[PDB]
Amino acid sequence: PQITLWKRPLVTIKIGGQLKEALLDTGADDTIIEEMSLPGRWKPKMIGGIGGFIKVRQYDQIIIEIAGHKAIGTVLVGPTPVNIIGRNLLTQIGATLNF
Amino acid sequence: PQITLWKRPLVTIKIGGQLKEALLDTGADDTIIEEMSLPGRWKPKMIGGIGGFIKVRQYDQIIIEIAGHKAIGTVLVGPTPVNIIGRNLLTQIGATLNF
């Protein structure tokens, strides 16, 4: 798909068998989702956003489907205004910016 | 051009007569630039994201050259950690996400 930016680039994702909405975010290094249960161990990570830094939980090698495209990679869980798909998974689904 | 997302999608912009580096950010509704002077009227605004909210000045009808392409729109100025080109100007240069 070709996604224009006149509205927010919201897509459906599937993680742990559940459908969620998430924003495709080229300004995000990493993928972060709202509080939910993920399998396995987690590690700490600090992330910087527009209003400051926050601590989050980093879960590696998580299966996630994004707009029907399969990915397996790192997902952060923490306080975010919206679920965000960042570059670590956008690269896996082959996304590019074009102008 | 076609920009991959292996690294942060940084481009050179010209705004207010000044050259700056900025991030092409599809997650951002708005364009946000580090503290600088711009001509004309402004009004205060709060914008938020991970880590909370920051107060900015909202300038309307500002012309910005983005990687060689001219666009006009609202620009927010304030203590952002990175200059951000958001969707309000990405649309004007014809930027799309493709996968």
């Binding site: 300004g27 995000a28 992330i47 910087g48 830094f53 960042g86 | 942060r8 952002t80 990175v82």
Partner: peptide
């Protein structure tokens, strides 16, 4: 630190 905006 990584940045998310």
């Amino acid at each position: 630190y990584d940045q998310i905006i």
